[PDB]
Amino acid sequence: TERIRNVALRSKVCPAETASELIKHGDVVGTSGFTGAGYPKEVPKALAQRMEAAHDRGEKYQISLITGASTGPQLDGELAKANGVYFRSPFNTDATMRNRINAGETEYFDNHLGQVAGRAVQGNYGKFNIALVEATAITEDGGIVPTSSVGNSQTFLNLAEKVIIEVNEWQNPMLEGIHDIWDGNVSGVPTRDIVPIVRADQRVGGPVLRVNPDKIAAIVRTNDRDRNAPFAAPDETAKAIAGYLLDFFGHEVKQNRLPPSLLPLQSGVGNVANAVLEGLKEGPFENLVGYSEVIQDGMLAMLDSGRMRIASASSFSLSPEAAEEINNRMDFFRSKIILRQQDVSNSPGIIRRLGCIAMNGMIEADIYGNVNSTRVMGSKMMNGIGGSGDFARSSYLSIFLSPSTAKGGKISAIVPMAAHVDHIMQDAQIFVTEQGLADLRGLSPVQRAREIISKCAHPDYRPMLQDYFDRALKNSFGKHTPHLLTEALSWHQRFIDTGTMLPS
Amino acid sequence: TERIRNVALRSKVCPAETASELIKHGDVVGTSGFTGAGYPKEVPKALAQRMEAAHDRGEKYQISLITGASTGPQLDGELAKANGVYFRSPFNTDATMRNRINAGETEYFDNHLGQVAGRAVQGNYGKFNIALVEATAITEDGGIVPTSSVGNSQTFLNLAEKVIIEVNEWQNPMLEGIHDIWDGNVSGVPTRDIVPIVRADQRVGGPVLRVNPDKIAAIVRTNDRDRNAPFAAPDETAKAIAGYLLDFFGHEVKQNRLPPSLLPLQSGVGNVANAVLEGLKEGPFENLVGYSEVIQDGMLAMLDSGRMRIASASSFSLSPEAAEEINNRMDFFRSKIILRQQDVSNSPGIIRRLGCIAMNGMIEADIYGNVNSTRVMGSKMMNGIGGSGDFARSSYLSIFLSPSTAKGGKISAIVPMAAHVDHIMQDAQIFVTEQGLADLRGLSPVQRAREIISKCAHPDYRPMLQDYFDRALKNSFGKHTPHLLTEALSWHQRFIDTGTMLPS
Numbered sequence A, B: 001t002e003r004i005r006n007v008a009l010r011s012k013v014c015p016a017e018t019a020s021e022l023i024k025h026g027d028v029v030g031t032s033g034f035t036g037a038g039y040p041k042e043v044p045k046a047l048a049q050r051m052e053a054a055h056d057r058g059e060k061y062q063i064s065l066i067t068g069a070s071t072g073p074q075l076d077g078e079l080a081k082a083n084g085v086y087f088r089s090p091f092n093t094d095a096t097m098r099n100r101i102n103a104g105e106t107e108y109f110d111n112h113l114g115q116v117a118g119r120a121v122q123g124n125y126g127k128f129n130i131a132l133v134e135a136t137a138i139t140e141d142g143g144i145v146p147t148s149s150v151g152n153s154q155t156f157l158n159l160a161e162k163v164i165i166e167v168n169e170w171q172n173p174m175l176e177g178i179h180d181i182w183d184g185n186v187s188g189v190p191t192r193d194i195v196p197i198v199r200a201d202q203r204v205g206g207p208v209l210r211v212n213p214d215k216i217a218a219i220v221r222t223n224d225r226d227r228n229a230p231f232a233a234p235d236e237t238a239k240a241i242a243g244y245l246l247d248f249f250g251h252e253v254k255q256n257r258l259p260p261s262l263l264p265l266q267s268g269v270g271n272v273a274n275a276v277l278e279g280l281k282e283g284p285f286e287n288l289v290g291y292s293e294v295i296q297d298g299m300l301a302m303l304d305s306g307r308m309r310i311a312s313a314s315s316f317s318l319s320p321e322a323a324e325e326i327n328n329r330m331d332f333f334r335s336k337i338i339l340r341q342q343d344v345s346n347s348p349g350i351i352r353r354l355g356c357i358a359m360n361g362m363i364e365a366d367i368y369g370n371v372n373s374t375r376v377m378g379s380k381m382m383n384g385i386g387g388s389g390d391f392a393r394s395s396y397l398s399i400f401l402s403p404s405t406a407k408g409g410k411i412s413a414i415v416p417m418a419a420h421v422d423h424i425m426q427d428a429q430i431f432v433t434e435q436g437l438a439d440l441r442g443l444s445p446v447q448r449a450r451e452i453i454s455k456c457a458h459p460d461y462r463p464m465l466q467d468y469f470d471r472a473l474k475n476s477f478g479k480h481t482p483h484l485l486t487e488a489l490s491w492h493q494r495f496i497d498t499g500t501m502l503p504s
């Protein structure tokens, strides 16, 4: 059936290429897209071509690209191969775009996902020229129905001078109704509203993005698939980590420090976080509730089980085999899920109010439990802080999950001093590896160290860590948080210098 | 007139010393006290004596001491001289207690002030045995009227098994009515309430702390003064910092990025933050609003001016000369001020909703704008993170203020890499020194560095910083956030090694 149900706007359809010409050099461009779901696909490819062309003729052609979160190959990928982005924000997982960022070719700054909207409205990123948003359909009265994510779309539509909509008939029409967009002022000019979300399954707004039709300069019909990263089956390390965490939960429930149905759960994606979710499905806990950034395959499974009553997120991030399952009983799942604006799904006030249990991965943690989420050796960007900082600081319990080693043994997940800090000690309470679970609740730095080292570190690095501690204790400039400054970062420089952390 | 207006509770008055015997060894003790205002004074002194005594006879006598924030000599001071605290939290400024912490003699963990209550209720600090709260008066129906701060008092009263109240006739009786205590569930068991503060001058609760009278084991009559740290007059460096910030404000107002009356202001205390406030009083801005942790002399002056309509905080922190002024027209000021629970004054949801401008000091910042608020050389505790993390991450604008050098030139406020991280890049946007103002809005790490270095660093260190950058750029393991790991911390080790950061 016909996707553009507003009669007049049909008059605004043109081809991807013609739409692309609307985007000038130096434009700040806000787009939909979040964990490889619901980003514009055709216009960006078209824009790439024209950029490569204009480059080969010695003329400048680059844009500022602000998304919800990570996009996919058609957007981040293409625009990067074509050297088309001078500034990116706030979160990328594209290999090509990564290399561009790490080479200094694209300026990057990974803001907290929950704050991007507010900073955009504040003017931090400059005036927005284009909003480029993918849509399932346009309603009779001109509402834009989002696709597989909501992200920052509503904010970009309100800020941008001109708007381009891609109506993608690949997206399932029954996504319509799954979203909840708030009418008022979430991240605008203070004083902001109270967004009265008091329960994860609650709807406070409507199913469509709102925009002055006059700003819609172009509507492109499309049919292209999302980036559907495939199911990374849990290995031995991940299964082990799940085990320790489910034990800990079972114990918290026994001590009456959590109810039998736990609290609202936020997990990321990985094989790590993915395993935890498989653990929970078989585990003893029932009536679970997700209040996450993302709905991944795990949550889908439990929504099916009945193990999870409801899941709230800003986007999907399914695998081909999962995506397929949902498209069938999309009528069922539609009623167990809610997709919200990312500034609502990552609202500190709401996360804290619901008491979320945050479960996030990490590069590395130092012995005092500071966390590195982003910059390998402290300088080389991986993905970005994302929403881990939103959930870690705001959650009821802040849990970090990781294997004890990276690079088949050559890197220790636990180190003397993290090369980059994303989450300070205050923002991390439970660490889990395949070695064991550290519980830092109520501890001082020094006691945090005993816990992390003896519970989490790998046998091969435990001793060296213990040694770093013991001597640091004796010699540190202060004894409160003891450090040997001359060899704090040394384990890193040693990897930089020899490709391993183990020494001679 | 009589302070204990509940007739029956008068039957519970005893002397400080007898009350002190209620506190056993190994007790977890929650007390009032916040920025040297409204902490218990007589019972602690009494407890110290008895601790020194029991020590001299070879018996163990120590408590866990949880406050609102910093207390004063009668409490933190005394209990420290007597080696009486085994664990402290969450924020201290007492010299003796500091030394104890830095010597490993007291275990310390500086939680975010806004989160202390929630963590207490969660059980992180253990079961609470005693709550020891100073009071202005007890109402006819048994309400506890707080004194010069509210802090965590209400939570401690609800958690503690036994309660001891010090009714201190030194405190002004007309403090009664100035407080706003919320009846519901701010930091308790999820799901928590919406605390509907939508405006800084708004009252949402009542003027008294509530507690089962039966838990009140003892009421001690007292008459002793608060720690009234004296007015640290603004010097040349501070006056300069104020100047740059007031310029920046004037400019934001011109570009219509802030209204003429700015937004709700949060400043700490120091000569630094103190100067800013004197700047504002004379400046062009009117109709100002404080939504802070603390009311210091600056805000008092403007409340007098009419320059500030209203100020919200969790405590006072006045100087003798200021304290004197307010005690006179206490009827006037009472109506311009509101003291709230610290978990309300430092609520992320509310700070973000009101769009606060946060102005905090710092030890040091690295070139990429990470901030150190706590640990000199990364190991030696100073005060604690306090509420700087609550306000920085949640605020509309996050400003840090500091002189470019510490220790008469021997330390640079800006360094290659901060020894300890409290506030990540994301959480800091404006830096100001007596050199200049850096505006990092929308910049990548590398552009952040150009700004900080060229605007903020001291001439004597600028060159060495620039050199550290330039070479790091060429050689860093990644080019996104460039670092020379072997000399990142070097400027610090150099001070540790020679007492200066300047080299040979």
Ligand SMILES: CC(C)(COP(=O)(O)OP(=O)(O)OC[C@H]1O[C@@H](n2cnc3c(N)ncnc32)[C@H](O)[C@@H]1OP(=O)(O)O)[C@@H](O)C(=O)NCCC(=O)NCCS
Residues within 6 Å of the ligand: A267, A268, A269, A270, A271, A272, A293, A294, A360, A361, A362, A363, A364, A373, A374, A376, A377, A382, A383, A384, A385, A386, A387, A388, A405, A406, A407, A411, A412, A413
């Ligand atoms: C930090 C993060 C990369 C790790 O998560 P993960 O799924 O477990 O990733 P892995 O541990 O399996 O490996 C990721 C990469 O980082 C590398 N890595 C992991 N630890 C490392 C370390 N201590 N040093 C260097 N590299 C490391 C891995 O080798 C791997 O590299 P590869 O692609 O070349 O094989 C990821 O969680 C992330 O970027 N988090 C940021 C934001 C976030 O948490 N949002 C919520 C969920 S989407």
Ligand SMILES: CC(C)(COP(=O)(O)OP(=O)(O)OC[C@H]1O[C@@H](n2cnc3c(N)ncnc32)[C@H](O)[C@@H]1OP(=O)(O)O)[C@@H](O)C(=O)NCCC(=O)NCCS
Residues within 6 Å of the ligand: B267, B268, B269, B270, B271, B272, B273, B293, B294, B360, B361, B362, B363, B364, B372, B373, B374, B376, B377, B382, B383, B384, B385, B386, B387, B388, B406, B407, B411, B412, B413
């Ligand atoms: C960071 C903080 C300690 C400095 O504030 P400040 O009093 O204005 O700074 P000052 O330079 O005037 O004095 C602070 C002390 O730290 C020292 N100091 C400052 N910078 C330093 C540095 N880079 N290295 C070592 N010491 C330093 C000063 O010499 C001074 O030491 P001393 O008085 O023992 O001789 C203080 O702001 C704080 O603890 N903040 C944490 C919590 C907070 O911001 N909450 C908000 C309301 S207060």
Ligand SMILES: [Cl-]
Residues within 6 Å of the ligand: A193, A194, A195, A196, A347, A349, A350, B349
């Ligand atoms: Cl809200």
Ligand SMILES: [Cl-]
Residues within 6 Å of the ligand: A440, A441, A442, A443, B111, B119, B124
């Ligand atoms: Cl804690």
Ligand SMILES: [Cl-]
Residues within 6 Å of the ligand: A349, B193, B194, B195, B196, B347, B349, B350
């Ligand atoms: Cl709230």
Ligand SMILES: [Cl-]
Residues within 6 Å of the ligand: A111, A119, A124, B440, B441, B442, B443
């Ligand atoms: Cl920004």
